Amino acid sequence: AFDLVVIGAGSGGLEAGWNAATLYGKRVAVVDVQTSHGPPFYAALGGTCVNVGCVPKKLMVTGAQYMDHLRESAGFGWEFDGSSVKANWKKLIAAKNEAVLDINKSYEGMFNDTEGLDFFLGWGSLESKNVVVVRETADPKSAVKERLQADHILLATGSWPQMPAIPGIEHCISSNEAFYLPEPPRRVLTVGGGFISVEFAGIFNAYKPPGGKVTLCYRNNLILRGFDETIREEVTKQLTANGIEIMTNENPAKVSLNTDGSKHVTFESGKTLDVDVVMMAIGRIPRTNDLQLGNVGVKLTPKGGVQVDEFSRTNVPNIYAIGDITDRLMLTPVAINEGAALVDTVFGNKPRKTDHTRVASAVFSIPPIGTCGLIEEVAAKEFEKVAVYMSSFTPLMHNISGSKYKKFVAKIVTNHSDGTVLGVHLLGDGAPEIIQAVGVCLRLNAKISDFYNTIGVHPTSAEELCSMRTPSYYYVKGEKMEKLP
Amino acid sequence: KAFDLVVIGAGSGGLEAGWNAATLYGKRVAVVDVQTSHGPPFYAALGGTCVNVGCVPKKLMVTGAQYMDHLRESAGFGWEFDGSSVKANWKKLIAAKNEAVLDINKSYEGMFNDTEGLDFFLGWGSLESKNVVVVRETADPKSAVKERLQADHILLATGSWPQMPAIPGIEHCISSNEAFYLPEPPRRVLTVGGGFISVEFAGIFNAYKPPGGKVTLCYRNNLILRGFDETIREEVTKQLTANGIEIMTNENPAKVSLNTDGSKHVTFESGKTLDVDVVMMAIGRIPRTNDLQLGNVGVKLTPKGGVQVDEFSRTNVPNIYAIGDITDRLMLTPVAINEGAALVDTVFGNKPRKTDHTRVASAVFSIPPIGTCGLIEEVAAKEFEKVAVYMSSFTPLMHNISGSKYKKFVAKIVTNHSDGTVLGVHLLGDGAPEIIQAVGVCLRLNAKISDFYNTIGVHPTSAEELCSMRTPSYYYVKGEKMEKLP
Numbered sequence: 001a002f003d004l005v006v007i008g009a010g011s012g013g014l015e016a017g018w019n020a021a022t023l024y025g026k027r028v029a030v031v032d033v034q035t036s037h038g039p040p041f042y043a044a045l046g047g048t049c050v051n052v053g054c055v056p057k058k059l060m061v062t063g064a065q066y067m068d069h070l071r072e073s074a075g076f077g078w079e080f081d082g083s084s085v086k087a088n089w090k091k092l093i094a095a096k097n098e099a100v101l102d103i104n105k106s107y108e109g110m111f112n113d114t115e116g117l118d119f120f121l122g123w124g125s126l127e128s129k130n131v132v133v134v135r136e137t138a139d140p141k142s143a144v145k146e147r148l149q150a151d152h153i154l155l156a157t158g159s160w161p162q163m164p165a166i167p168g169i170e171h172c173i174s175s176n177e178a179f180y181l182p183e184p185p186r187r188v189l190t191v192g193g194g195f196i197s198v199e200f201a202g203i204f205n206a207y208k209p210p211g212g213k214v215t216l217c218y219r220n221n222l223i224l225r226g227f228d229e230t231i232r233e234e235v236t237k238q239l240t241a242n243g244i245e246i247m248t249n250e251n252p253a254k255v256s257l258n259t260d261g262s263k264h265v266t267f268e269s270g271k272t273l274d275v276d277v278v279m280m281a282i283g284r285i286p287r288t289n290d291l292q293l294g295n296v297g298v299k300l301t302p303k304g305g306v307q308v309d310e311f312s313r314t315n316v317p318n319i320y321a322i323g324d325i326t327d328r329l330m331l332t333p334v335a336i337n338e339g340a341a342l343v344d345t346v347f348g349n350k351p352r353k354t355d356h357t358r359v360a361s362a363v364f365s366i367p368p369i370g371t372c373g374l375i376e377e378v379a380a381k382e383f384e385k386v387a388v389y390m391s392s393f394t395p396l397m398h399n400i401s402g403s404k405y406k407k408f409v410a411k412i413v414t415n416h417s418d419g420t421v422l423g424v425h426l427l428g429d430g431a432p433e434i435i436q437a438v439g440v441c442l443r444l445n446a447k448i449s450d451f452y453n454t455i456g457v458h459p460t461s462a463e464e465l466c467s468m469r470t471p472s473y474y475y476v477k478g479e480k481m482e483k484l485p
Numbered sequence: 486k487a488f489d490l491v492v493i494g495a496g497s498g499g500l501e502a503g504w505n506a507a508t509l510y511g512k513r514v515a516v517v518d519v520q521t522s523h524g525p526p527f528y529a530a531l532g533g534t535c536v537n538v539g540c541v542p543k544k545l546m547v548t549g550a551q552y553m554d555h556l557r558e559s560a561g562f563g564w565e566f567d568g569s570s571v572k573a574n575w576k577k578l579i580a581a582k583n584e585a586v587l588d589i590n591k592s593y594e595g596m597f598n599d600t601e602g603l604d605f606f607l608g609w610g611s612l613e614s615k616n617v618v619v620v621r622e623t624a625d626p627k628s629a630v631k632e633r634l635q636a637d638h639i640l641l642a643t644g645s646w647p648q649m650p651a652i653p654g655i656e657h658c659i660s661s662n663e664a665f666y667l668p669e670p671p672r673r674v675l676t677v678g679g680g681f682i683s684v685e686f687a688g689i690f691n692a693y694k695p696p697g698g699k700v701t702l703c704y705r706n707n708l709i710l711r712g713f714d715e716t717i718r719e720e721v722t723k724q725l726t727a728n729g730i731e732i733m734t735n736e737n738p739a740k741v742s743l744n745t746d747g748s749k750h751v752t753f754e755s756g757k758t759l760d761v762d763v764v765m766m767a768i769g770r771i772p773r774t775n776d777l778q779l780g781n782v783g784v785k786l787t788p789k790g791g792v793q794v795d796e797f798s799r800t801n802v803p804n805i806y807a808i809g810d811i812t813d814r815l816m817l818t819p820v821a822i823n824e825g826a827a828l829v830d831t832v833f834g835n836k837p838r839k840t841d842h843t844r845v846a847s848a849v850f851s852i853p854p855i856g857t858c859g860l861i862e863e864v865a866a867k868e869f870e871k872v873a874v875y876m877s878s879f880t881p882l883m884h885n886i887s888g889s890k891y892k893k894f895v896a897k898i899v900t901n902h903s904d905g906t907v908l909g910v911h912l913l914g915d916g917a918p919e920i921i922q923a924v925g926v927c928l929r930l931n932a933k934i935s936d937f938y939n940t941i942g943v944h945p946t947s948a949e950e951l952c953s954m955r956t957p958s959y960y961y962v963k964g965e966k967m968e969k970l971p
């Protein structure tokens with residue numbers, strides 16, 4: 001029998017398994033449906049992040065940024081045969097595939113060289129409070145390969161893309177298939193306002209063949225809901241400046257195939273659009289339907305997530321749940337932190353719970369976003385006096401590069417009673433790297449005075465965070481006003 | 486012409502002090518400088534050395550140089566074009582760089598024109614008496630007087646100047662001032678000096694050199710970038726060598742002569758020789774005290790050459806102050822800004838503030854760049870009983886695909902191991918200058934190592950390495966380097 005069985009060899013499942021086995025000598029089993037990236041199941045050993053998430057996403061955005069580099073280099077005297085330029089999508093994917101497969105292999109080797117840490121290929125599910133069955137397929141009636149006896153069971157199966165119930169949805173893809181398109185689409189429509197749709201819009205915009213067009217549609221008025229609103233409006237503009245068509249207050253109603261294999265999209269508003277690819281990126285839902293949670297009584301939240309307490313425990317004793325399946329912060333480092341904290345509490349004498357506040361995240365759009373803490377309108381409903389410090393500027397190089405539209409935005413939100421910084425929001429190149437150390441600042445409850453009394457590093461964009469001393473406006477009892485009464 | 490404040494030197498520190506005194510405390514301010522825009526004959530001008538012949542132009546040209554790597558590295562991500570058609574136009578880079586600096590010059594002139602009690606005077610300032618700044622047509626005390634500015638307070642803020650060694654043929658060499666206006670990119674160039682100016686210009690010249698070119702950097706001691714973390718000093722040496730730059734350590738030029746075609750014949754103290762088209766001296770910058778007539782009123786200099794000041798920027802003469810490079814401490818623009826702002830708060834706002842010169846974050850825009858804040862381990866070991874070093878070094882994944890496998894990232898955290906306080910952070914790699922900024926805020930808060938690795942990381946970034954080091958790589962006990970503790 002195993003001290004612990006983990007269903008899902010992803011960001012959270014692997015941290016919890018490795019720690020419990022190497023730090024505490026416990027006997028661990030880990031189940032995943034594949035050993036290497038790709039169809040049919042896309043995610044595999046490593047998790048969504050390694051196989052069809054952060055890692056290949058970052059590589060493909062890097063590749064897409066070269067479209068700007070090539071164009072901007074002329075402002076600094078560089079020339080080359082523009083007509084010979086080709087963005088070879090098939091080589092990008094091949095390089096991504098080999099980079100991901102290398103990670104797949106190293107995790108494979110990890111299991112083969114760690115005693116007390118074993119991997120089982122198959123589909124895991126709950127047969128009882130103490131048994132995880134491994135079948136050949138997600139079908140509960142498929143052949144059994146294993147029945148793992150477990151003193152503790154960890155649910156860490158991640159999440160799965162959400163798809164709307166419209167006629168012709170089968171002709172639409174999600175981010176999973178976008179990583180494996182054999183050719184770069186000339187015309188693509190990304191559906192959604194979230195970070196996945198924006199990031200892939202930039203990727204497709206760079207590698208599209210001549211005559212191409214990337215359209216992004218969103219059912220409400222402003223994309224990237226949940227991010228700072230100044231950044232939301234500015235990123236919309238800068239995407240438009242780089243050729244992406246942003247189509248707000250629109251939503252697909254049906255999709256049919258044209259005689260050439262392209263898709264005819266009809267929107268609820270009657271508008272129509274023909275594209276080669278339609279990528280649904282309207283949300284990620286917890287991946288629970290294959291686990292047979294009813295066999296055991298694991299309760300879910302109203303919106304489909306596995307309900308846990310601040311220590312990641314389900315209502316069933318000795319059954320825990322971490323990561324995206326809990327439907328809180330769908331971030332890789334969070335799932336790692338929840339995995340490590342769980343094992344410390346269960347297999348050690350050090351109870352530890354992960355802080356889900358003041359977590360720094362990023363969006364690798366072109367231009368990128370970096371954020372940590374509360375946006376202002378949320379803070380306005382939680383604090384009596386709120387100050388907003390805002391600063392927009394054109395970085396030095398973009399006065400020469402030919403990309404004047406690349407304005408950098410820095411915003412700081414404080415509790416104005418004592419100047420405690422509640423949120424920092426950045427837009428512009430470098431923002432993802434700038435914001436990491438800002439997260440450390442907010443654990444230490446840094447005040448605005450701690451930022452503008454720190455001496456800047458010149459010339460940097462991050463310098464701006466230490467150059468703001470006077471609020472641009474306030475919120476008192478939830479009311480926006482420039483000057484205080 | 487009775488001013489509250491007269492500033493000699495319209496630079497980084499001088500401009501901050503004059504603007505604060507005028508706009509925040511309604512004081513009448515005069516500011517003196519020798520030009521209103523960048524370039525010859527005097528190079529620095531309205532805006533200072535940073536705007537005109539320092540950080541700002543330096544940065545734009547390094548950015549242009551980085552496109553040599555971008556264009557090569559793009560192939561790994563599927564980008565295809567005619568490699569043989571790639572050319573770098575140096576005159577376009579200079580021309581574009583001049584436009585951007587002049588826009589800053591123009592902007593500053595409009596600030597003076599539109600702000601009450603903030604007047605600009607063109608000429609050369611100097612001390613006539615304790616309360617009189619005289620402005621002449623040239624730096625020569627015999628040149629004609631333009632104004633005598635009556636001043637209740639005087640601020641010395643003239644910056645620094647490139648130091649040129651007294652070797653035969655020095656007249657055939659240049660400094661960084663002239664490098665910003667070279668009509669052509671040198672095919673062969675020798676940057677003399679191991680500091681950040683020489684390293685950064687090596688990167689620039691390496692990217693824009695015509696075919697068959699070579700950049701050589703020489704330094705009289707064994708390892709370049711003294712003062713920085715030793716690991717990073719060695720890695721940048723490797724990564725400069727990896728990008729084609731010959732480093733020539735333990736060598737120092739002894740003379741320069743002219744060849745028939747106009748090139749320079751360099752003879753080193755070791756008897757070695759080298760032929761280059763340009764010799765750029767960047768061995769140091771010295772405080773610019775020679776034209777101020779400090780002896781007239783008796784402003785004292787330190788044993789080192791800078792204007793002696795107490796922690797509130799006050800000189801030995803009452804109502805005369807000095808900030809910035811002329812005080813010859815940390816020759817950084819943001820420090821001169823901070824010193825100038827603290828000076829005005831103290832003098833005019835009865836708000837006594839002084840600049841903290843410790844834990845200052847700074848950068849080197851080498852390719853790849855450096856970001857640093859706080860102490861290096863050698864210095865912390867002489868100052869703390871138990872010291873620990875957390876170290877992580879690796880080639881990022883993107884640079885495996887890009888083909889630049891030599892671009893090893895380096896993160897190092899130095900701590901006082903007795904309580905875990907972070908004493909210094911040192912970075913090498915893309916984004917290091919941007920990462921290190923908020924690290925200065927962390928060190929201002931006396932952050933501890935645990936504050937870093939208990940912060941949730943941002944993935945995937947280089948910065949998140951700073952939050953995933955929790956076990957020291959080695960220690961310094963009583964100044965002795967060891968891997969494990971006793």
Ligand SMILES: Cc1cc2nc3c(=O)[nH]c(=O)nc-3n(C[C@H](O)[C@H](O)[C@H](O)COP(=O)(O)OP(=O)(O)OC[C@H]3O[C@@H](n4cnc5c(N)ncnc54)[C@H](O)[C@@H]3O)c2cc1C
Pocket residue numbers: 007008009010011012013031032033034041043044045046047048049050052053054057122123124125156157158159175196287290291322323324325329330331332333335944945
């Ligand atoms: C396109 C995209 C980009 C992203 N970019 C980022 C980013 O930049 N930064 C970031 O922090 N996060 C990002 N995320 C989110 C991140 O990938 C997840 O938050 C992260 O994987 C944490 O999830 P987890 O560890 O809980 O589960 P995962 O890491 O998803 O692992 C779940 C694993 O369980 C397996 N599994 C599922 N069901 C079963 C079953 N029945 N039996 C056996 N195995 C099963 C799956 O194959 C999978 O490998 C991105 C996600 C996507 C889709």
Ligand SMILES: Cc1cc2nc3c(=O)[nH]c(=O)nc-3n(C[C@H](O)[C@H](O)[C@H](O)COP(=O)(O)OP(=O)(O)OC[C@H]3O[C@@H](n4cnc5c(N)ncnc54)[C@H](O)[C@@H]3O)c2cc1C
Pocket residue numbers: 458459493494495496497498499517518519520527529530531532533534535536538539540541543608609610611624642643644645661682773776777808809810811815816817818819821
């Ligand atoms: C090539 C180079 C690159 C650099 N890069 C960086 C960097 O990346 N980051 C950074 O932080 N720092 C950098 N520095 C340093 C930075 O430029 C200086 O530390 C900063 O400009 C000093 O400001 P200051 O106020 O002391 O005087 P300065 O800014 O030097 O201004 C002094 C001014 O006084 C004027 N002046 C001189 N004598 C007289 C007189 N008799 N009468 C009237 N006016 C006079 C001059 O014309 C000059 O404009 C760099 C310096 C150089 C040379």
Ligand SMILES: C(#Cc1nc(-c2ccc3c(ccn3C[C@@H]3CCCN3)c2)sc1C1(N2CCCC2)CCCCC1)CNCC1CCC1
Pocket residue numbers: 014015018106107109110111112113114332944
């Ligand atoms: C990694 C890794 C890693 N590689 C290991 C490993 C690697 C190789 C192994 C073994 C055991 C045997 N081998 C084979 C030997 C040793 C290396 C090659 N040959 C173990 S163990 C390991 C770690 N765990 C794996 C699952 C998550 C925790 C993560 C890194 C710290 C050490 C543990 C990359 N981390 C980046 C992520 C993205 C968010 C953080």
Ligand SMILES: C(#Cc1nc(-c2ccc3c(ccn3C[C@@H]3CCCN3)c2)sc1C1(N2CCCC2)CCCCC1)CNCC1CCC1
Pocket residue numbers: 500501504536541589592593595596597599600
């Ligand atoms: C700056 C600035 C700045 N511009 C000002 C300014 C600029 C223009 C002004 C006035 C007052 C009137 N004008 C003219 C306006 C312009 C449009 C209409 N008329 C004031 S005031 C000002 C500040 N300092 C004053 C002395 C120089 C720095 C810094 C920014 C906050 C305000 C003061 C940074 N420039 C970027 C480069 C990168 C290295 C430096």
